């Protein structure tokens, strides 16, 4: 049982950062002043964030 | 296209149609007044010709 727990802990912690898959990153900004976009500050809409 | 950009361009087209209608009405009134004055002046010229 301890061996199972250790192996599953490695599997889990491996699965968050490395083996992850995220959104598509479609971009649209409303403010007219902004002209350059960092392309990483894009977040999903609150309606999607809560559901996720 | 995206929904936010869609609503934005829709609102923009609505505002553009509104402003175009207003400016067209203003220019039509101005042209009508000026053409009325011009016809009042040119009546005598047409009668003479």
PDB file of N, CA and C in Angstrom:
ATOM      1  N   UNK A   1       0.822  -1.204   0.000  1.00  0.00           N
ATOM      2  CA  UNK A   1       0.000   0.000   0.000  1.00  0.00           C
ATOM      3  C   UNK A   1       0.859   1.257   0.000  1.00  0.00           C
ATOM      4  N   UNK A   2       1.949   1.255   0.769  1.00  0.00           N
ATOM      5  CA  UNK A   2       2.838   2.412   0.738  1.00  0.00           C
ATOM      6  C   UNK A   2       3.444   2.613  -0.640  1.00  0.00           C
ATOM      7  N   UNK A   3       3.829   1.526  -1.304  1.00  0.00           N
ATOM      8  CA  UNK A   3       4.368   1.671  -2.651  1.00  0.00           C
ATOM      9  C   UNK A   3       3.329   2.266  -3.588  1.00  0.00           C
ATOM     10  N   UNK A   4       2.083   1.805  -3.482  1.00  0.00           N
ATOM     11  CA  UNK A   4       1.028   2.379  -4.306  1.00  0.00           C
ATOM     12  C   UNK A   4       0.878   3.868  -4.037  1.00  0.00           C
ATOM     13  N   UNK A   5       0.895   4.262  -2.763  1.00  0.00           N
ATOM     14  CA  UNK A   5       0.719   5.672  -2.442  1.00  0.00           C
ATOM     15  C   UNK A   5       1.848   6.511  -3.019  1.00  0.00           C
ATOM     16  N   UNK A   6       3.086   6.029  -2.921  1.00  0.00           N
ATOM     17  CA  UNK A   6       4.208   6.809  -3.430  1.00  0.00           C
ATOM     18  C   UNK A   6       4.137   6.945  -4.948  1.00  0.00           C
ATOM     19  N   UNK A   7       3.852   5.840  -5.641  1.00  0.00           N
ATOM     20  CA  UNK A   7       3.778   5.899  -7.097  1.00  0.00           C
ATOM     21  C   UNK A   7       2.653   6.818  -7.554  1.00  0.00           C
ATOM     22  N   UNK A   8       1.514   6.787  -6.861  1.00  0.00           N
ATOM     23  CA  UNK A   8       0.412   7.653  -7.258  1.00  0.00           C
ATOM     24  C   UNK A   8       0.706   9.110  -6.928  1.00  0.00           C
ATOM     25  N   UNK A   9       1.461   9.368  -5.859  1.00  0.00           N
ATOM     26  CA  UNK A   9       1.861  10.744  -5.584  1.00  0.00           C
ATOM     27  C   UNK A   9       2.740  11.287  -6.699  1.00  0.00           C
ATOM     28  N   UNK A  10       3.703  10.485  -7.165  1.00  0.00           N
ATOM     29  CA  UNK A  10       4.514  10.934  -8.295  1.00  0.00           C
ATOM     30  C   UNK A  10       3.657  11.149  -9.535  1.00  0.00           C
ATOM     31  N   UNK A  11       2.719  10.239  -9.803  1.00  0.00           N
ATOM     32  CA  UNK A  11       1.852  10.403 -10.966  1.00  0.00           C
ATOM     33  C   UNK A  11       1.067  11.701 -10.892  1.00  0.00           C
ATOM     34  N   UNK A  12       0.463  11.978  -9.740  1.00  0.00           N
ATOM     35  CA  UNK A  12      -0.319  13.197  -9.583  1.00  0.00           C
ATOM     36  C   UNK A  12       0.546  14.430  -9.787  1.00  0.00           C
ATOM     37  N   UNK A  13       1.614  14.570  -8.998  1.00  0.00           N
ATOM     38  CA  UNK A  13       2.398  15.800  -9.067  1.00  0.00           C
ATOM     39  C   UNK A  13       3.019  15.962 -10.448  1.00  0.00           C
ATOM     40  N   UNK A  14       3.240  14.855 -11.154  1.00  0.00           N
ATOM     41  CA  UNK A  14       3.718  14.947 -12.527  1.00  0.00           C
ATOM     42  C   UNK A  14       2.652  15.527 -13.443  1.00  0.00           C
ATOM     43  N   UNK A  15       1.383  15.341 -13.093  1.00  0.00           N
ATOM     44  CA  UNK A  15       0.271  15.607 -13.995  1.00  0.00           C
ATOM     45  C   UNK A  15      -0.218  17.046 -13.952  1.00  0.00           C
ATOM     46  N   UNK A  16       0.254  17.876 -13.024  1.00  0.00           N
ATOM     47  CA  UNK A  16      -0.261  19.236 -12.941  1.00  0.00           C
ATOM     48  C   UNK A  16       0.464  20.161 -13.904  1.00  0.00           C
ATOM     49  N   UNK A  17       1.779  20.294 -13.746  1.00  0.00           N
ATOM     50  CA  UNK A  17       2.513  21.244 -14.570  1.00  0.00           C
ATOM     51  C   UNK A  17       2.857  20.656 -15.930  1.00  0.00           C
ATOM     52  N   UNK A  18       3.489  19.483 -15.947  1.00  0.00           N
ATOM     53  CA  UNK A  18       4.106  18.993 -17.176  1.00  0.00           C
ATOM     54  C   UNK A  18       3.074  18.502 -18.181  1.00  0.00           C
ATOM     55  N   UNK A  19       2.222  17.558 -17.786  1.00  0.00           N
ATOM     56  CA  UNK A  19       1.294  16.908 -18.705  1.00  0.00           C
ATOM     57  C   UNK A  19      -0.017  17.672 -18.862  1.00  0.00           C
ATOM     58  N   UNK A  20      -0.015  18.979 -18.616  1.00  0.00           N
ATOM     59  CA  UNK A  20      -1.254  19.743 -18.613  1.00  0.00           C
ATOM     60  C   UNK A  20      -1.626  20.219 -20.012  1.00  0.00           C
ATOM     61  N   UNK A  21      -2.909  20.533 -20.185  1.00  0.00           N
ATOM     62  CA  UNK A  21      -3.443  21.101 -21.418  1.00  0.00           C
ATOM     63  C   UNK A  21      -4.423  22.204 -21.048  1.00  0.00           C
ATOM     64  N   UNK A  22      -4.319  23.354 -21.717  1.00  0.00           N
ATOM     65  CA  UNK A  22      -5.158  24.484 -21.334  1.00  0.00           C
ATOM     66  C   UNK A  22      -5.945  25.046 -22.510  1.00  0.00           C
ATOM     67  N   UNK A  23      -6.527  26.227 -22.326  1.00  0.00           N
ATOM     68  CA  UNK A  23      -7.490  26.792 -23.256  1.00  0.00           C
ATOM     69  C   UNK A  23      -6.830  27.173 -24.581  1.00  0.00           C
ATOM     70  N   UNK A  24      -7.644  27.744 -25.472  1.00  0.00           N
ATOM     71  CA  UNK A  24      -7.196  28.008 -26.836  1.00  0.00           C
ATOM     72  C   UNK A  24      -6.547  29.379 -26.965  1.00  0.00           C
ATOM     73  N   UNK A  25      -6.869  30.298 -26.053  1.00  0.00           N
ATOM     74  CA  UNK A  25      -6.305  31.646 -26.017  1.00  0.00           C
ATOM     75  C   UNK A  25      -6.771  32.534 -27.167  1.00  0.00           C
ATOM     76  N   UNK A  26      -8.061  32.507 -27.491  1.00  0.00           N
ATOM     77  CA  UNK A  26      -8.603  33.517 -28.393  1.00  0.00           C
ATOM     78  C   UNK A  26      -8.623  34.873 -27.699  1.00  0.00           C
ATOM     79  N   UNK A  27      -8.135  35.900 -28.391  1.00  0.00           N
ATOM     80  CA  UNK A  27      -7.855  37.193 -27.777  1.00  0.00           C
ATOM     81  C   UNK A  27      -8.745  38.264 -28.390  1.00  0.00           C
ATOM     82  N   UNK A  28      -9.319  39.109 -27.534  1.00  0.00           N
ATOM     83  CA  UNK A  28     -10.065  40.293 -27.948  1.00  0.00           C
ATOM     84  C   UNK A  28     -10.099  41.275 -26.788  1.00  0.00           C
ATOM     85  N   UNK A  29      -9.698  42.517 -27.046  1.00  0.00           N
ATOM     86  CA  UNK A  29      -9.618  43.548 -26.018  1.00  0.00           C
ATOM     87  C   UNK A  29     -10.563  44.683 -26.395  1.00  0.00           C
ATOM     88  N   UNK A  30     -11.220  45.262 -25.387  1.00  0.00           N
ATOM     89  CA  UNK A  30     -12.193  46.320 -25.644  1.00  0.00           C
ATOM     90  C   UNK A  30     -11.543  47.697 -25.596  1.00  0.00           C
ATOM     91  N   UNK A  31     -10.655  47.916 -24.631  1.00  0.00           N
ATOM     92  CA  UNK A  31     -10.081  49.238 -24.416  1.00  0.00           C
ATOM     93  C   UNK A  31      -9.369  49.723 -25.675  1.00  0.00           C
ATOM     94  N   UNK A  32      -9.595  50.968 -26.101  1.00  0.00           N
ATOM     95  CA  UNK A  32      -8.928  51.451 -27.317  1.00  0.00           C
ATOM     96  C   UNK A  32      -7.500  51.897 -27.082  1.00  0.00           C
ATOM     97  N   UNK A  33      -7.152  52.280 -25.853  1.00  0.00           N
ATOM     98  CA  UNK A  33      -5.815  52.801 -25.594  1.00  0.00           C
ATOM     99  C   UNK A  33      -4.754  51.724 -25.764  1.00  0.00           C
ATOM    100  N   UNK A  34      -5.039  50.505 -25.312  1.00  0.00           N
ATOM    101  CA  UNK A  34      -4.049  49.436 -25.332  1.00  0.00           C
ATOM    102  C   UNK A  34      -3.744  49.048 -26.772  1.00  0.00           C
ATOM    103  N   UNK A  35      -2.458  48.975 -27.105  1.00  0.00           N
ATOM    104  CA  UNK A  35      -2.028  48.631 -28.449  1.00  0.00           C
ATOM    105  C   UNK A  35      -1.086  47.436 -28.494  1.00  0.00           C
ATOM    106  N   UNK A  36      -0.449  47.088 -27.380  1.00  0.00           N
ATOM    107  CA  UNK A  36       0.454  45.947 -27.301  1.00  0.00           C
ATOM    108  C   UNK A  36      -0.037  45.028 -26.194  1.00  0.00           C
ATOM    109  N   UNK A  37      -0.112  43.735 -26.486  1.00  0.00           N
ATOM    110  CA  UNK A  37      -0.711  42.767 -25.584  1.00  0.00           C
ATOM    111  C   UNK A  37       0.319  41.723 -25.174  1.00  0.00           C
ATOM    112  N   UNK A  38       0.335  41.392 -23.880  1.00  0.00           N
ATOM    113  CA  UNK A  38       1.381  40.525 -23.350  1.00  0.00           C
ATOM    114  C   UNK A  38       1.185  39.078 -23.783  1.00  0.00           C
ATOM    115  N   UNK A  39      -0.032  38.718 -24.180  1.00  0.00           N
ATOM    116  CA  UNK A  39      -0.443  37.400 -24.666  1.00  0.00           C
ATOM    117  C   UNK A  39      -0.416  36.347 -23.563  1.00  0.00           C
ATOM    118  N   UNK A  40      -0.123  36.720 -22.319  1.00  0.00           N
ATOM    119  CA  UNK A  40      -0.221  35.799 -21.200  1.00  0.00           C
ATOM    120  C   UNK A  40      -1.168  36.262 -20.111  1.00  0.00           C
ATOM    121  N   UNK A  41      -1.532  37.539 -20.082  1.00  0.00           N
ATOM    122  CA  UNK A  41      -2.515  38.033 -19.133  1.00  0.00           C
ATOM    123  C   UNK A  41      -3.934  37.645 -19.519  1.00  0.00           C
ATOM    124  N   UNK A  42      -4.111  36.966 -20.647  1.00  0.00           N
ATOM    125  CA  UNK A  42      -5.436  36.532 -21.058  1.00  0.00           C
ATOM    126  C   UNK A  42      -5.980  35.507 -20.079  1.00  0.00           C
ATOM    127  N   UNK A  43      -7.159  35.786 -19.537  1.00  0.00           N
ATOM    128  CA  UNK A  43      -7.825  34.883 -18.606  1.00  0.00           C
ATOM    129  C   UNK A  43      -9.166  34.496 -19.214  1.00  0.00           C
ATOM    130  N   UNK A  44      -9.815  33.436 -18.752  1.00  0.00           N
ATOM    131  CA  UNK A  44     -11.162  33.141 -19.233  1.00  0.00           C
ATOM    132  C   UNK A  44     -12.196  34.001 -18.522  1.00  0.00           C
ATOM    133  N   UNK A  45     -13.357  34.119 -19.158  1.00  0.00           N
ATOM    134  CA  UNK A  45     -14.442  34.903 -18.589  1.00  0.00           C
ATOM    135  C   UNK A  45     -14.924  34.282 -17.285  1.00  0.00           C
ATOM    136  N   UNK A  46     -15.378  35.141 -16.370  1.00  0.00           N
ATOM    137  CA  UNK A  46     -15.779  34.684 -15.041  1.00  0.00           C
ATOM    138  C   UNK A  46     -16.815  33.569 -15.119  1.00  0.00           C
ATOM    139  N   UNK A  47     -17.745  33.666 -16.071  1.00  0.00           N
ATOM    140  CA  UNK A  47     -18.751  32.623 -16.233  1.00  0.00           C
ATOM    141  C   UNK A  47     -18.099  31.276 -16.518  1.00  0.00           C
ATOM    142  N   UNK A  48     -17.022  31.277 -17.302  1.00  0.00           N
ATOM    143  CA  UNK A  48     -16.303  30.038 -17.566  1.00  0.00           C
ATOM    144  C   UNK A  48     -15.439  29.635 -16.384  1.00  0.00           C
ATOM    145  N   UNK A  49     -14.845  30.612 -15.699  1.00  0.00           N
ATOM    146  CA  UNK A  49     -13.935  30.308 -14.603  1.00  0.00           C
ATOM    147  C   UNK A  49     -14.657  29.617 -13.458  1.00  0.00           C
ATOM    148  N   UNK A  50     -15.846  30.099 -13.097  1.00  0.00           N
ATOM    149  CA  UNK A  50     -16.596  29.442 -12.038  1.00  0.00           C
ATOM    150  C   UNK A  50     -16.996  28.024 -12.402  1.00  0.00           C
ATOM    151  N   UNK A  51     -17.489  27.837 -13.628  1.00  0.00           N
ATOM    152  CA  UNK A  51     -17.914  26.513 -14.073  1.00  0.00           C
ATOM    153  C   UNK A  51     -16.741  25.546 -14.047  1.00  0.00           C
ATOM    154  N   UNK A  52     -15.558  26.018 -14.446  1.00  0.00           N
ATOM    155  CA  UNK A  52     -14.381  25.158 -14.394  1.00  0.00           C
ATOM    156  C   UNK A  52     -13.986  24.853 -12.957  1.00  0.00           C
TER     157      UNK A  52
ATOM    158  N   UNK B   1     -15.892  35.258 -36.015  1.00  0.00           N
ATOM    159  CA  UNK B   1     -15.394  36.288 -35.120  1.00  0.00           C
ATOM    160  C   UNK B   1     -15.957  36.097 -33.714  1.00  0.00           C
ATOM    161  N   UNK B   2     -15.377  36.830 -32.766  1.00  0.00           N
ATOM    162  CA  UNK B   2     -15.751  36.724 -31.376  1.00  0.00           C
ATOM    163  C   UNK B   2     -17.001  37.508 -31.033  1.00  0.00           C
ATOM    164  N   UNK B   3     -17.713  37.073 -29.992  1.00  0.00           N
ATOM    165  CA  UNK B   3     -18.954  37.766 -29.615  1.00  0.00           C
ATOM    166  C   UNK B   3     -18.740  39.191 -29.140  1.00  0.00           C
ATOM    167  N   UNK B   4     -17.676  39.454 -28.378  1.00  0.00           N
ATOM    168  CA  UNK B   4     -17.430  40.814 -27.915  1.00  0.00           C
ATOM    169  C   UNK B   4     -17.163  41.754 -29.085  1.00  0.00           C
ATOM    170  N   UNK B   5     -16.287  41.348 -30.006  1.00  0.00           N
ATOM    171  CA  UNK B   5     -16.033  42.157 -31.192  1.00  0.00           C
ATOM    172  C   UNK B   5     -17.291  42.302 -32.035  1.00  0.00           C
ATOM    173  N   UNK B   6     -18.119  41.255 -32.080  1.00  0.00           N
ATOM    174  CA  UNK B   6     -19.370  41.337 -32.824  1.00  0.00           C
ATOM    175  C   UNK B   6     -20.283  42.410 -32.252  1.00  0.00           C
ATOM    176  N   UNK B   7     -20.512  42.381 -30.937  1.00  0.00           N
ATOM    177  CA  UNK B   7     -21.347  43.404 -30.317  1.00  0.00           C
ATOM    178  C   UNK B   7     -20.737  44.788 -30.495  1.00  0.00           C
ATOM    179  N   UNK B   8     -19.408  44.884 -30.416  1.00  0.00           N
ATOM    180  CA  UNK B   8     -18.749  46.175 -30.574  1.00  0.00           C
ATOM    181  C   UNK B   8     -18.988  46.747 -31.964  1.00  0.00           C
ATOM    182  N   UNK B   9     -18.771  45.940 -33.003  1.00  0.00           N
ATOM    183  CA  UNK B   9     -18.937  46.446 -34.361  1.00  0.00           C
ATOM    184  C   UNK B   9     -20.410  46.691 -34.668  1.00  0.00           C
ATOM    185  N   UNK B  10     -21.311  45.936 -34.033  1.00  0.00           N
ATOM    186  CA  UNK B  10     -22.735  46.194 -34.226  1.00  0.00           C
ATOM    187  C   UNK B  10     -23.122  47.544 -33.640  1.00  0.00           C
ATOM    188  N   UNK B  11     -22.679  47.820 -32.412  1.00  0.00           N
ATOM    189  CA  UNK B  11     -22.938  49.121 -31.805  1.00  0.00           C
ATOM    190  C   UNK B  11     -22.300  50.239 -32.622  1.00  0.00           C
ATOM    191  N   UNK B  12     -21.102  49.991 -33.154  1.00  0.00           N
ATOM    192  CA  UNK B  12     -20.424  50.999 -33.960  1.00  0.00           C
ATOM    193  C   UNK B  12     -21.200  51.291 -35.238  1.00  0.00           C
ATOM    194  N   UNK B  13     -21.708  50.245 -35.894  1.00  0.00           N
ATOM    195  CA  UNK B  13     -22.495  50.445 -37.106  1.00  0.00           C
ATOM    196  C   UNK B  13     -23.797  51.174 -36.801  1.00  0.00           C
ATOM    197  N   UNK B  14     -24.419  50.863 -35.662  1.00  0.00           N
ATOM    198  CA  UNK B  14     -25.633  51.576 -35.269  1.00  0.00           C
ATOM    199  C   UNK B  14     -25.353  53.061 -35.064  1.00  0.00           C
ATOM    200  N   UNK B  15     -24.309  53.379 -34.294  1.00  0.00           N
ATOM    201  CA  UNK B  15     -23.960  54.775 -34.059  1.00  0.00           C
ATOM    202  C   UNK B  15     -23.589  55.479 -35.358  1.00  0.00           C
ATOM    203  N   UNK B  16     -22.901  54.777 -36.259  1.00  0.00           N
ATOM    204  CA  UNK B  16     -22.532  55.370 -37.537  1.00  0.00           C
ATOM    205  C   UNK B  16     -23.762  55.672 -38.378  1.00  0.00           C
ATOM    206  N   UNK B  17     -24.729  54.751 -38.409  1.00  0.00           N
ATOM    207  CA  UNK B  17     -25.965  54.992 -39.149  1.00  0.00           C
ATOM    208  C   UNK B  17     -26.702  56.190 -38.567  1.00  0.00           C
ATOM    209  N   UNK B  18     -26.731  56.288 -37.235  1.00  0.00           N
ATOM    210  CA  UNK B  18     -27.410  57.409 -36.588  1.00  0.00           C
ATOM    211  C   UNK B  18     -26.756  58.738 -36.954  1.00  0.00           C
ATOM    212  N   UNK B  19     -25.432  58.820 -36.802  1.00  0.00           N
ATOM    213  CA  UNK B  19     -24.721  60.055 -37.116  1.00  0.00           C
ATOM    214  C   UNK B  19     -24.835  60.399 -38.596  1.00  0.00           C
ATOM    215  N   UNK B  20     -24.816  59.383 -39.463  1.00  0.00           N
ATOM    216  CA  UNK B  20     -24.946  59.622 -40.895  1.00  0.00           C
ATOM    217  C   UNK B  20     -26.321  60.185 -41.213  1.00  0.00           C
ATOM    218  N   UNK B  21     -27.366  59.632 -40.594  1.00  0.00           N
ATOM    219  CA  UNK B  21     -28.712  60.156 -40.805  1.00  0.00           C
ATOM    220  C   UNK B  21     -28.812  61.604 -40.343  1.00  0.00           C
ATOM    221  N   UNK B  22     -28.253  61.903 -39.166  1.00  0.00           N
ATOM    222  CA  UNK B  22     -28.316  63.268 -38.649  1.00  0.00           C
ATOM    223  C   UNK B  22     -27.589  64.247 -39.568  1.00  0.00           C
ATOM    224  N   UNK B  23     -26.362  63.906 -39.970  1.00  0.00           N
ATOM    225  CA  UNK B  23     -25.593  64.796 -40.835  1.00  0.00           C
ATOM    226  C   UNK B  23     -26.243  64.933 -42.206  1.00  0.00           C
ATOM    227  N   UNK B  24     -26.853  63.858 -42.711  1.00  0.00           N
ATOM    228  CA  UNK B  24     -27.525  63.920 -44.003  1.00  0.00           C
ATOM    229  C   UNK B  24     -28.730  64.842 -43.926  1.00  0.00           C
ATOM    230  N   UNK B  25     -29.498  64.759 -42.836  1.00  0.00           N
ATOM    231  CA  UNK B  25     -30.622  65.672 -42.660  1.00  0.00           C
ATOM    232  C   UNK B  25     -30.146  67.120 -42.578  1.00  0.00           C
ATOM    233  N   UNK B  26     -29.070  67.368 -41.827  1.00  0.00           N
ATOM    234  CA  UNK B  26     -28.550  68.728 -41.713  1.00  0.00           C
ATOM    235  C   UNK B  26     -28.096  69.265 -43.066  1.00  0.00           C
ATOM    236  N   UNK B  27     -27.327  68.467 -43.810  1.00  0.00           N
ATOM    237  CA  UNK B  27     -26.838  68.907 -45.113  1.00  0.00           C
ATOM    238  C   UNK B  27     -27.984  69.092 -46.098  1.00  0.00           C
ATOM    239  N   UNK B  28     -29.012  68.245 -46.016  1.00  0.00           N
ATOM    240  CA  UNK B  28     -30.171  68.399 -46.885  1.00  0.00           C
ATOM    241  C   UNK B  28     -30.894  69.706 -46.595  1.00  0.00           C
ATOM    242  N   UNK B  29     -31.062  70.040 -45.313  1.00  0.00           N
ATOM    243  CA  UNK B  29     -31.699  71.305 -44.959  1.00  0.00           C
ATOM    244  C   UNK B  29     -30.877  72.491 -45.457  1.00  0.00           C
ATOM    245  N   UNK B  30     -29.555  72.423 -45.282  1.00  0.00           N
ATOM    246  CA  UNK B  30     -28.695  73.516 -45.734  1.00  0.00           C
ATOM    247  C   UNK B  30     -28.755  73.681 -47.248  1.00  0.00           C
ATOM    248  N   UNK B  31     -28.656  72.572 -47.985  1.00  0.00           N
ATOM    249  CA  UNK B  31     -28.726  72.632 -49.440  1.00  0.00           C
ATOM    250  C   UNK B  31     -30.088  73.127 -49.903  1.00  0.00           C
ATOM    251  N   UNK B  32     -31.156  72.748 -49.196  1.00  0.00           N
ATOM    252  CA  UNK B  32     -32.485  73.224 -49.559  1.00  0.00           C
ATOM    253  C   UNK B  32     -32.599  74.730 -49.377  1.00  0.00           C
ATOM    254  N   UNK B  33     -32.105  75.252 -48.252  1.00  0.00           N
ATOM    255  CA  UNK B  33     -32.153  76.695 -48.027  1.00  0.00           C
ATOM    256  C   UNK B  33     -31.332  77.443 -49.076  1.00  0.00           C
ATOM    257  N   UNK B  34     -30.106  76.976 -49.327  1.00  0.00           N
ATOM    258  CA  UNK B  34     -29.247  77.648 -50.295  1.00  0.00           C
ATOM    259  C   UNK B  34     -29.833  77.578 -51.700  1.00  0.00           C
ATOM    260  N   UNK B  35     -30.429  76.438 -52.065  1.00  0.00           N
ATOM    261  CA  UNK B  35     -31.027  76.302 -53.387  1.00  0.00           C
ATOM    262  C   UNK B  35     -32.280  77.155 -53.516  1.00  0.00           C
ATOM    263  N   UNK B  36     -33.028  77.325 -52.422  1.00  0.00           N
ATOM    264  CA  UNK B  36     -34.175  78.225 -52.446  1.00  0.00           C
ATOM    265  C   UNK B  36     -33.731  79.662 -52.695  1.00  0.00           C
ATOM    266  N   UNK B  37     -32.680  80.100 -51.998  1.00  0.00           N
ATOM    267  CA  UNK B  37     -32.159  81.448 -52.227  1.00  0.00           C
ATOM    268  C   UNK B  37     -31.653  81.591 -53.661  1.00  0.00           C
ATOM    269  N   UNK B  38     -30.933  80.578 -54.151  1.00  0.00           N
ATOM    270  CA  UNK B  38     -30.390  80.635 -55.504  1.00  0.00           C
ATOM    271  C   UNK B  38     -31.500  80.680 -56.548  1.00  0.00           C
ATOM    272  N   UNK B  39     -32.583  79.934 -56.329  1.00  0.00           N
ATOM    273  CA  UNK B  39     -33.697  79.980 -57.259  1.00  0.00           C
ATOM    274  C   UNK B  39     -34.436  81.303 -57.211  1.00  0.00           C
ATOM    275  N   UNK B  40     -34.586  81.872 -56.012  1.00  0.00           N
ATOM    276  CA  UNK B  40     -35.183  83.198 -55.891  1.00  0.00           C
ATOM    277  C   UNK B  40     -34.371  84.230 -56.664  1.00  0.00           C
ATOM    278  N   UNK B  41     -33.044  84.093 -56.642  1.00  0.00           N
ATOM    279  CA  UNK B  41     -32.199  85.023 -57.391  1.00  0.00           C
ATOM    280  C   UNK B  41     -32.281  84.747 -58.890  1.00  0.00           C
ATOM    281  N   UNK B  42     -32.305  83.467 -59.275  1.00  0.00           N
ATOM    282  CA  UNK B  42     -32.204  83.104 -60.687  1.00  0.00           C
ATOM    283  C   UNK B  42     -33.546  83.180 -61.405  1.00  0.00           C
ATOM    284  N   UNK B  43     -34.639  83.397 -60.671  1.00  0.00           N
ATOM    285  CA  UNK B  43     -35.938  83.571 -61.313  1.00  0.00           C
ATOM    286  C   UNK B  43     -35.905  84.726 -62.309  1.00  0.00           C
ATOM    287  N   UNK B  44     -35.334  85.861 -61.897  1.00  0.00           N
ATOM    288  CA  UNK B  44     -35.246  87.019 -62.783  1.00  0.00           C
ATOM    289  C   UNK B  44     -34.354  86.711 -63.979  1.00  0.00           C
ATOM    290  N   UNK B  45     -33.263  85.974 -63.756  1.00  0.00           N
ATOM    291  CA  UNK B  45     -32.369  85.626 -64.857  1.00  0.00           C
ATOM    292  C   UNK B  45     -33.070  84.736 -65.874  1.00  0.00           C
ATOM    293  N   UNK B  46     -33.855  83.767 -65.396  1.00  0.00           N
ATOM    294  CA  UNK B  46     -34.601  82.900 -66.304  1.00  0.00           C
ATOM    295  C   UNK B  46     -35.669  83.683 -67.057  1.00  0.00           C
ATOM    296  N   UNK B  47     -36.363  84.590 -66.366  1.00  0.00           N
ATOM    297  CA  UNK B  47     -37.359  85.422 -67.034  1.00  0.00           C
ATOM    298  C   UNK B  47     -36.721  86.284 -68.117  1.00  0.00           C
ATOM    299  N   UNK B  48     -35.524  86.812 -67.851  1.00  0.00           N
ATOM    300  CA  UNK B  48     -34.843  87.634 -68.846  1.00  0.00           C
ATOM    301  C   UNK B  48     -34.368  86.798 -70.026  1.00  0.00           C
ATOM    302  N   UNK B  49     -33.791  85.624 -69.753  1.00  0.00           N
ATOM    303  CA  UNK B  49     -33.302  84.769 -70.830  1.00  0.00           C
ATOM    304  C   UNK B  49     -34.450  84.238 -71.682  1.00  0.00           C
TER     305      UNK B  49
END
